[PDB]
PDB file of C-alpha atoms and ligand atoms in Angstrom:
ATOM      1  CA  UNK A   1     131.089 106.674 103.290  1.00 47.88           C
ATOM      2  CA  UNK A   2     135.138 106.912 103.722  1.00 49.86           C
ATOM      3  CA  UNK A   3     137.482 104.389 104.908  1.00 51.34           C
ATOM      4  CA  UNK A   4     136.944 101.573 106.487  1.00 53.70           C
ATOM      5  CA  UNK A   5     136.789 101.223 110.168  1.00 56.03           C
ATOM      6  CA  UNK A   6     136.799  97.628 112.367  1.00 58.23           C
ATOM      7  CA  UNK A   7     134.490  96.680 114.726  1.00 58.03           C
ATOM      8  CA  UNK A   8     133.937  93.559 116.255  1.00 60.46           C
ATOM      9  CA  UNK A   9     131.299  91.854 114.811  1.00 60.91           C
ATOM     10  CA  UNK A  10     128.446  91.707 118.268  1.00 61.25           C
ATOM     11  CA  UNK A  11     128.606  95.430 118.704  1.00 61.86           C
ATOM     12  CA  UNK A  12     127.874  96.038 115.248  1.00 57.45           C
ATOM     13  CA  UNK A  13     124.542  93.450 115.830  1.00 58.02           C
ATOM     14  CA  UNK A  14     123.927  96.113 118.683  1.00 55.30           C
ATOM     15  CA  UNK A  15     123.903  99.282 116.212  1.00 54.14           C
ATOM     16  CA  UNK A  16     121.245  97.588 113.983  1.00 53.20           C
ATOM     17  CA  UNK A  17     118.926  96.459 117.025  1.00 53.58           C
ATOM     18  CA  UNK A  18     119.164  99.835 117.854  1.00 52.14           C
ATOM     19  CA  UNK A  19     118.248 100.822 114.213  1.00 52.16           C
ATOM     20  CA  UNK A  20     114.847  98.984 114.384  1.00 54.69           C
ATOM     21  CA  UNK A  21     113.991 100.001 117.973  1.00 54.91           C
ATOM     22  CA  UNK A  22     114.692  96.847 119.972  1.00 53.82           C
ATOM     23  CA  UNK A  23     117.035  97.704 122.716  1.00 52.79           C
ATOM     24  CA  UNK A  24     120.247  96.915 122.872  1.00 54.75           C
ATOM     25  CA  UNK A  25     119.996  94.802 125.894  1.00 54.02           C
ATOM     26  CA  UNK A  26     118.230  92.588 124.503  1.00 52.97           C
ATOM     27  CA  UNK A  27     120.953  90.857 121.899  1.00 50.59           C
ATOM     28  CA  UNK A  28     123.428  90.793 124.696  1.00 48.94           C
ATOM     29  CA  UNK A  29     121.868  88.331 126.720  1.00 46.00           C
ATOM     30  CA  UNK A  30     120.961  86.067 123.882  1.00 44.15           C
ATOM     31  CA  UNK A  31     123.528  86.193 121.585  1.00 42.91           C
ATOM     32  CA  UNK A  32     123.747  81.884 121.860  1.00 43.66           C
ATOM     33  CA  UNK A  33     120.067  81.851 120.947  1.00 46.54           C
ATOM     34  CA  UNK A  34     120.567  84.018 117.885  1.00 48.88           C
ATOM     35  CA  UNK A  35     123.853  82.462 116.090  1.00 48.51           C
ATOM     36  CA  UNK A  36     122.266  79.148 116.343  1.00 49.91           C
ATOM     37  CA  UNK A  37     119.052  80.336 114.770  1.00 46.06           C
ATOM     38  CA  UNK A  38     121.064  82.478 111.977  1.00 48.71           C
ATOM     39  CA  UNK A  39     123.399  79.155 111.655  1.00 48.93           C
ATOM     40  CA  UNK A  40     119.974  76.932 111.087  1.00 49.42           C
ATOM     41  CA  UNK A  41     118.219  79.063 108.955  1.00 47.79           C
ATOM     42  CA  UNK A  42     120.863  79.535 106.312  1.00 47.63           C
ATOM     43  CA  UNK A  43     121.976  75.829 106.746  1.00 46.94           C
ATOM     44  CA  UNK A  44     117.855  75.214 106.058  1.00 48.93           C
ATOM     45  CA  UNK A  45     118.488  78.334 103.344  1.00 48.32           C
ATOM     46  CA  UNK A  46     121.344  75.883 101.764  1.00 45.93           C
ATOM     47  CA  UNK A  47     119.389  72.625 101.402  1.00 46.59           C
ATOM     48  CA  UNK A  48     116.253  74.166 100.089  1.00 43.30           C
ATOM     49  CA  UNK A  49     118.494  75.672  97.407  1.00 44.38           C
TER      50      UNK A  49
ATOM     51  CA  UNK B   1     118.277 108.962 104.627  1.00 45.37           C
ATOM     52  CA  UNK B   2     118.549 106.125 102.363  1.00 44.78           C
ATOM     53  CA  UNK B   3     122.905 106.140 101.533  1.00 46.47           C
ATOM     54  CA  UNK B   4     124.325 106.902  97.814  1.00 42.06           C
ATOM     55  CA  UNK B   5     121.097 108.449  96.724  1.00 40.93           C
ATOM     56  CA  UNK B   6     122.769 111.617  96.673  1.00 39.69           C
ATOM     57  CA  UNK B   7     126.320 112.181  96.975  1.00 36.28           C
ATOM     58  CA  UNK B   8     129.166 109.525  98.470  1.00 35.67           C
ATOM     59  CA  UNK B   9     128.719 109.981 101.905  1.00 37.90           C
ATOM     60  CA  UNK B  10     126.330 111.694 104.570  1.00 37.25           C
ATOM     61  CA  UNK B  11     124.546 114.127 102.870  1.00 38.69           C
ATOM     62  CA  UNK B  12     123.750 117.913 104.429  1.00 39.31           C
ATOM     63  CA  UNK B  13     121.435 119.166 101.581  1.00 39.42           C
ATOM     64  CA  UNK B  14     122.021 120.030  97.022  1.00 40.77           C
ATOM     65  CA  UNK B  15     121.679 122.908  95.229  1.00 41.60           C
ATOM     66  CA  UNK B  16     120.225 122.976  91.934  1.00 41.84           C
ATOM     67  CA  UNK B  17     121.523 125.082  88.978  1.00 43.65           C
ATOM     68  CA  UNK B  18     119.885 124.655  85.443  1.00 41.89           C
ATOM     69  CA  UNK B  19     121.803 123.727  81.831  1.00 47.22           C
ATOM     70  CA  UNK B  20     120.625 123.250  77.981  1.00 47.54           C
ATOM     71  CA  UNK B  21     118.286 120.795  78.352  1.00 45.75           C
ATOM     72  CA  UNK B  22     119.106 119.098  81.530  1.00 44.65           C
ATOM     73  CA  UNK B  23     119.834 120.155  85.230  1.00 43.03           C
ATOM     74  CA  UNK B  24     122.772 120.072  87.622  1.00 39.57           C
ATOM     75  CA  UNK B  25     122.703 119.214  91.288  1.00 41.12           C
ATOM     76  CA  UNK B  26     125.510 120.537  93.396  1.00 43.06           C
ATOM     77  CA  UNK B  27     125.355 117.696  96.451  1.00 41.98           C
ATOM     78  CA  UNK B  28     126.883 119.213  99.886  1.00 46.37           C
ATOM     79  CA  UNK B  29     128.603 115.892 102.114  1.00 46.05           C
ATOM     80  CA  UNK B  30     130.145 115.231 105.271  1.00 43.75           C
ATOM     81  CA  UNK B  31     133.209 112.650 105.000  1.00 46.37           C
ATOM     82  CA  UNK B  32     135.427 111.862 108.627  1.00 45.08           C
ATOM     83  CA  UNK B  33     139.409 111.124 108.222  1.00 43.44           C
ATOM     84  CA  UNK B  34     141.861 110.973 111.040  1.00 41.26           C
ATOM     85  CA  UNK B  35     140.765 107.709 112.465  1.00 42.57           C
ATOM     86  CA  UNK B  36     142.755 106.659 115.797  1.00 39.18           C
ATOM     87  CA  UNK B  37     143.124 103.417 117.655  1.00 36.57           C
ATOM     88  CA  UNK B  38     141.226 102.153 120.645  1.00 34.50           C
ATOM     89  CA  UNK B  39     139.930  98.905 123.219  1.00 31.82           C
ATOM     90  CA  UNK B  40     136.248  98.467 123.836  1.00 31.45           C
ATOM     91  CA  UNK B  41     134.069  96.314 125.788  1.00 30.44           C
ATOM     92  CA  UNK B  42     130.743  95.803 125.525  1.00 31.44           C
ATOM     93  CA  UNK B  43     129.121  96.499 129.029  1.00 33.87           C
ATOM     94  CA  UNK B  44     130.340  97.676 132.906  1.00 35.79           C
ATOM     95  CA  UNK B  45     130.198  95.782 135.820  1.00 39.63           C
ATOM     96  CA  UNK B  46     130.066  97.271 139.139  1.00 44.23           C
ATOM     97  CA  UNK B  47     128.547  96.393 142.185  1.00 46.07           C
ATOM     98  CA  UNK B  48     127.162  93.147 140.961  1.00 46.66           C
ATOM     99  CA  UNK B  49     125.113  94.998 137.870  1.00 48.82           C
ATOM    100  CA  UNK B  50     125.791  95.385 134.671  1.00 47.67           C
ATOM    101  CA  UNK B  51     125.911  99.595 132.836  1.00 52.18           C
ATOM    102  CA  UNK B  52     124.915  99.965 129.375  1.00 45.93           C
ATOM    103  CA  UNK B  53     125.448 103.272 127.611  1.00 50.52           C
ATOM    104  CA  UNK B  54     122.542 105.196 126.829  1.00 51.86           C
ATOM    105  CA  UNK B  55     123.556 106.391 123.747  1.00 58.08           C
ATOM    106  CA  UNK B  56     127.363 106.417 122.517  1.00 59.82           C
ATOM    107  CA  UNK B  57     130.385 103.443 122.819  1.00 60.59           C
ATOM    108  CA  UNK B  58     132.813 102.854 125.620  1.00 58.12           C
ATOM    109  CA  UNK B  59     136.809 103.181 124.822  1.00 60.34           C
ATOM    110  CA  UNK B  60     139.771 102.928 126.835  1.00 61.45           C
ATOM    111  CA  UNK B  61     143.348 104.443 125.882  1.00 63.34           C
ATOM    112  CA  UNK B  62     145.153 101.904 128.336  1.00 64.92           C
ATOM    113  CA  UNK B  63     143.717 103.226 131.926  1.00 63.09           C
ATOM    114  CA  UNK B  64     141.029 105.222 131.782  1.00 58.22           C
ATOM    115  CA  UNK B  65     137.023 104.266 130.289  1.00 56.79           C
ATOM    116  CA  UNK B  66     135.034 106.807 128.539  1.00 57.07           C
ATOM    117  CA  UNK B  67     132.564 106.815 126.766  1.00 59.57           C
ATOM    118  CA  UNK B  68     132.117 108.597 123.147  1.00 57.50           C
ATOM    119  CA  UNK B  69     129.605 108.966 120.253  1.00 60.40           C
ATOM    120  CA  UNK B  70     130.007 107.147 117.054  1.00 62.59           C
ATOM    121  CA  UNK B  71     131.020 109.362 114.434  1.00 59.34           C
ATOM    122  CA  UNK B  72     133.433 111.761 116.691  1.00 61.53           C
ATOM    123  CA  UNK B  73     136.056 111.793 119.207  1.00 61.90           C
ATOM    124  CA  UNK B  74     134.883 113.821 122.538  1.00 60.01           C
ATOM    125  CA  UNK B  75     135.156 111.722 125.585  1.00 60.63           C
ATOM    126  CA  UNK B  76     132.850 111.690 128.691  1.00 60.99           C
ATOM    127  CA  UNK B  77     133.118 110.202 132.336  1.00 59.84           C
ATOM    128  CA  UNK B  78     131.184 107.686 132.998  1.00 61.32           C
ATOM    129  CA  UNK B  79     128.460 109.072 135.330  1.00 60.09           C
ATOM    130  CA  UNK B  80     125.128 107.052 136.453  1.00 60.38           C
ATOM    131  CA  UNK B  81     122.661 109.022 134.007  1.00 61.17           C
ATOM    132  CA  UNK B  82     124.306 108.753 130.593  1.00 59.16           C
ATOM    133  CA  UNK B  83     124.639 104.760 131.290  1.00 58.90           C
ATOM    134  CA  UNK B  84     121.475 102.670 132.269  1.00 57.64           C
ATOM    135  CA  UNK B  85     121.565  99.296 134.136  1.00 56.41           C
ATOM    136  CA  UNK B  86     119.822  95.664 133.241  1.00 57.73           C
ATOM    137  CA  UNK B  87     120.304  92.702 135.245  1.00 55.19           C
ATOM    138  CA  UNK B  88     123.392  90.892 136.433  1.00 57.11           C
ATOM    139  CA  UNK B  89     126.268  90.609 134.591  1.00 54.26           C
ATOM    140  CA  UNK B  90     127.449  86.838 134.651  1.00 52.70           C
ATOM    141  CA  UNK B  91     125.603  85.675 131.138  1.00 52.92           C
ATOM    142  CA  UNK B  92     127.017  88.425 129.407  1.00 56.98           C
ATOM    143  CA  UNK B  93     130.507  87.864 127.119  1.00 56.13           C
ATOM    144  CA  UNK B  94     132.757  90.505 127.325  1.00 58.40           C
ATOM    145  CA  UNK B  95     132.370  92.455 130.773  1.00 55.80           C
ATOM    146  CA  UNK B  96     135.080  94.256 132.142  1.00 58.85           C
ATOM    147  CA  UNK B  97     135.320  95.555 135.894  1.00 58.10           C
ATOM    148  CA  UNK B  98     135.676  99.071 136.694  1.00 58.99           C
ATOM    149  CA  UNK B  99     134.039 101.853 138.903  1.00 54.70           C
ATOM    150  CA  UNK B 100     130.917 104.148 137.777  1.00 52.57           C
ATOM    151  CA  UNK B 101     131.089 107.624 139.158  1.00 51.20           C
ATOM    152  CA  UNK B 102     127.778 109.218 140.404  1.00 50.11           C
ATOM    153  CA  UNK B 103     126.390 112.862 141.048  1.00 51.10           C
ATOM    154  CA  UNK B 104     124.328 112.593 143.485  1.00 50.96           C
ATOM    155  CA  UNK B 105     126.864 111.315 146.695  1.00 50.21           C
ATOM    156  CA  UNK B 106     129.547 114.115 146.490  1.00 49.00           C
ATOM    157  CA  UNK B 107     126.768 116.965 146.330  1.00 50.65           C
ATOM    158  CA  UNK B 108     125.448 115.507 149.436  1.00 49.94           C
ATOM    159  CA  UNK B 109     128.668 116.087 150.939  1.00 47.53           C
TER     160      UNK B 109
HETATM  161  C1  LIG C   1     144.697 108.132 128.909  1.00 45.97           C
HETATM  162  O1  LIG C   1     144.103 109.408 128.925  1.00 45.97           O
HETATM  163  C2  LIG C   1     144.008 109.977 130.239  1.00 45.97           C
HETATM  164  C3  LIG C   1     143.276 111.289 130.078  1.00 45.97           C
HETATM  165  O2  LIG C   1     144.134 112.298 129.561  1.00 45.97           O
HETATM  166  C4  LIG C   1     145.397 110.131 130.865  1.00 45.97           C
HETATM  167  O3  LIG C   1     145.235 110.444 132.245  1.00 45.97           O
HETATM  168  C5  LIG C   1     145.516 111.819 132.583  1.00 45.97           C
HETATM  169  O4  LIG C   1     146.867 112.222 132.315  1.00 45.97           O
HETATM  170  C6  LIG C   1     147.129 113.591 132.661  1.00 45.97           C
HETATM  171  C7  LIG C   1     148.545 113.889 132.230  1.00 45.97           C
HETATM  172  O5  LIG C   1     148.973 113.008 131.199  1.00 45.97           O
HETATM  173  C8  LIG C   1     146.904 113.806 134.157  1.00 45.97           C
HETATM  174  O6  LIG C   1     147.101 115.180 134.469  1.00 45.97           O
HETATM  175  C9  LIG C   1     145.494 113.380 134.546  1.00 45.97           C
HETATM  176  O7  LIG C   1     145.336 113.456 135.959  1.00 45.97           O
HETATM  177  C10 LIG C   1     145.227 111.953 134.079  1.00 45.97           C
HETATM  178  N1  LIG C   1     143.868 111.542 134.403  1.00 45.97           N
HETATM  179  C11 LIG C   1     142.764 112.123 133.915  1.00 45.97           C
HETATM  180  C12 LIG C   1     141.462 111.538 134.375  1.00 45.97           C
HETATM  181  O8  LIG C   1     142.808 113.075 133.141  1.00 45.97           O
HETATM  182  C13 LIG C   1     146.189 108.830 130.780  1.00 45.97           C
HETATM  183  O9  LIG C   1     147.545 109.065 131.145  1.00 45.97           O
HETATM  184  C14 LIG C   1     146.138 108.239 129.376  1.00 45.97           C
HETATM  185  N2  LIG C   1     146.793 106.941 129.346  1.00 45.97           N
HETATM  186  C15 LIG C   1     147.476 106.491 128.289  1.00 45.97           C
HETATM  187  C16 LIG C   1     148.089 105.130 128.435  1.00 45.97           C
HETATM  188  O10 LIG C   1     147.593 107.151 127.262  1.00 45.97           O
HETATM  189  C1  LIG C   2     138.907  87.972 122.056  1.00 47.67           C
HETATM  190  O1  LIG C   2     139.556  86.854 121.435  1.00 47.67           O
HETATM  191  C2  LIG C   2     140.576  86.246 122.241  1.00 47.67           C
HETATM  192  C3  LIG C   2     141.207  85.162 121.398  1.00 47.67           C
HETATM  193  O2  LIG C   2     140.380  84.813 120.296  1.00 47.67           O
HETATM  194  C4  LIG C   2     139.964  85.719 123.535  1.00 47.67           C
HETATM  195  O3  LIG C   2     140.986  85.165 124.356  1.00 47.67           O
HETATM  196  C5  LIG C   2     140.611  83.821 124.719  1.00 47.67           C
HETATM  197  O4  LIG C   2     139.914  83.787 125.974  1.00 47.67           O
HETATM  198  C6  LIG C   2     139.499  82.469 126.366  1.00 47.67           C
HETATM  199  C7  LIG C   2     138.708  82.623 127.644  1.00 47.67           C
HETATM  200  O5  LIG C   2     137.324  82.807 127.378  1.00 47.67           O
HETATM  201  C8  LIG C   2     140.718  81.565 126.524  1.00 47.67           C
HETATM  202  O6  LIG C   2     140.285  80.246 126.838  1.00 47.67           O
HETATM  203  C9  LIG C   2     141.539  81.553 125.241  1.00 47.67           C
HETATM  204  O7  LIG C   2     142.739  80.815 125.435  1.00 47.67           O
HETATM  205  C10 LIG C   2     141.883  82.977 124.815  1.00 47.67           C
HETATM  206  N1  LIG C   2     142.602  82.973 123.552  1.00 47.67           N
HETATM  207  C11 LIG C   2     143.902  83.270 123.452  1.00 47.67           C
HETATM  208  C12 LIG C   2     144.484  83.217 122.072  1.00 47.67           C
HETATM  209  O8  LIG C   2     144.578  83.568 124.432  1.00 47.67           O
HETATM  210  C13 LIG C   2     139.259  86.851 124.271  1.00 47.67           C
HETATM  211  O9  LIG C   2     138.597  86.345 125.423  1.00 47.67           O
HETATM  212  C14 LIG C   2     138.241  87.525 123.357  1.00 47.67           C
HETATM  213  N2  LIG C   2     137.615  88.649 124.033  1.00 47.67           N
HETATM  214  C15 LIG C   2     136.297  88.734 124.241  1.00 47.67           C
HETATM  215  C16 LIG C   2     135.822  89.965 124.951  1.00 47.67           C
HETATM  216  O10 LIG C   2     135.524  87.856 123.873  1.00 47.67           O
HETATM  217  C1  LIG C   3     136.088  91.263 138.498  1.00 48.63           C
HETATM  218  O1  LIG C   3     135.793  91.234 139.885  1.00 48.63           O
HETATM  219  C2  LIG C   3     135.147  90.025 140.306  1.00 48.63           C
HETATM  220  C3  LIG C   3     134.795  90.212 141.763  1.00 48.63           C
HETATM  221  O2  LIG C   3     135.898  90.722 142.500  1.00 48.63           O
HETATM  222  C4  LIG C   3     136.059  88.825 140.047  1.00 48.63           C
HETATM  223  O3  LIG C   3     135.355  87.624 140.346  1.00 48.63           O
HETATM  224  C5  LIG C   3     135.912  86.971 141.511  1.00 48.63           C
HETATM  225  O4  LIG C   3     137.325  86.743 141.388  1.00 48.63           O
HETATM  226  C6  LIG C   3     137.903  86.132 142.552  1.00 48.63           C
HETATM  227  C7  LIG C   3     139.393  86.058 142.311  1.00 48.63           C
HETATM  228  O5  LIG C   3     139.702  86.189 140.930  1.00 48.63           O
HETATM  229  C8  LIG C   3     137.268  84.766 142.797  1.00 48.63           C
HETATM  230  O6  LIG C   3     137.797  84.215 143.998  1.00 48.63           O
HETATM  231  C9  LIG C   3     135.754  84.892 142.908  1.00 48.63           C
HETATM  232  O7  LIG C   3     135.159  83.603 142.995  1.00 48.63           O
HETATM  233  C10 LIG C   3     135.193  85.632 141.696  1.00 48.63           C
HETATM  234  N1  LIG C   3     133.751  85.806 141.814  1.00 48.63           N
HETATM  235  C11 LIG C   3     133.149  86.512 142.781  1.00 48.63           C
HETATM  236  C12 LIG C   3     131.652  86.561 142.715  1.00 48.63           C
HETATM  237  O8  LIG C   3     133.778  87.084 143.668  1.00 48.63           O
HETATM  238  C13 LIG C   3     136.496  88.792 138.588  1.00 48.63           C
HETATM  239  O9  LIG C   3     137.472  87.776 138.390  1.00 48.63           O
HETATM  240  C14 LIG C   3     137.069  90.143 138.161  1.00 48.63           C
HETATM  241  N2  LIG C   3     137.409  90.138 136.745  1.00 48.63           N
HETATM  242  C15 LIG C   3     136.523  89.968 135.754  1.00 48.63           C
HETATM  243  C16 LIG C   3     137.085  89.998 134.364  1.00 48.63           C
HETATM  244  O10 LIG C   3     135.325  89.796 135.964  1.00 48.63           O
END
């Protein structure tokens, strides 16, 4: 929509929680949990390919 | 709702004018310029809990934590209502310690 602004890359995960209606406490607390599940699936994503 | 559908931006509302054979939307759009510079941090710890804000972004210019909307520049004091609390904050990566003013204790005053 204009030019580009930064933003570290957690608080952005925290806008699109928000977005679907899951607080964003939630992600905060298990932010371990989630990049190992998003590093696993596209790892499983890689071999199936 | 759905972005570049109509116009290049975020869209306020089209007008429609006709032609030939053919029509001709006019799109009305809201673009921000002017950015600035600032430090955030993801949470507020004070008095062994952990704040949240409600609905907005903390920022800092150096000294001094406010918290401000997204797409605009107006900044706030950090009172107890705009900012909600969940847990304790020693799992969380990020925290910063500061002081959260409240309402409530000077009015009793
Ligand atoms: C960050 O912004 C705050 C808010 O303006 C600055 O603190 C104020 O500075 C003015 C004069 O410069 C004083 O009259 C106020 O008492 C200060 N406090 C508040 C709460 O307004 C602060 O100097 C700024 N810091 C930097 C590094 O830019
Ligand atoms: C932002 O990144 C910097 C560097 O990537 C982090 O600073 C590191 O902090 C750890 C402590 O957790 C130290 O062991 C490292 O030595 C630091 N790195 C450097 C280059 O000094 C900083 O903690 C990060 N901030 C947040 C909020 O995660
Ligand atoms: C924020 O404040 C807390 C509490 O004052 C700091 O944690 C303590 O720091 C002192 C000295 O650095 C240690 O002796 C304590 O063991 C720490 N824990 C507790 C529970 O008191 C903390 O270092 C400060 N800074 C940050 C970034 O959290």
């Amino acid at each position: 929509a204009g030019a580009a602004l930064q933003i570290p890359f957690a608080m952005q995960m925290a806008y699109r929680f928000n977005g679907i209606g899951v607080t964003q406490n939630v992600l905060y607390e298990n932010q371990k949990l989630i990049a190992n599940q998003f590093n696993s699936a596209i790892g499983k994503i890689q071999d199936s390919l | 709702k759905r972005v570049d559908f109509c116009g290049k931006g975020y869209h306020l509302m089209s007008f429609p004018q006709s032609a030939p054979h053919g029509v001709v939307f006019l799109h009305v759009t809201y673009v921000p310029a002017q950015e600035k510079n600032f430090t955030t941090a993801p949470a507020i710890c004070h008095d062994g809990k952990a704040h949240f804000p409600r609905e907005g972004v903390f920022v800092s210019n150096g000294t001094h934590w406010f918290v401000t909307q997204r797409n605009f520049y107006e900044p706030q004091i950090i009172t107890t209502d705009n900012t909600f609390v969940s847990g304790n904050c020693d799992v969380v990566i990020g925290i910063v310690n500061n002081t959260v003013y409240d309402p409530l204790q000077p009015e009793l005053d």
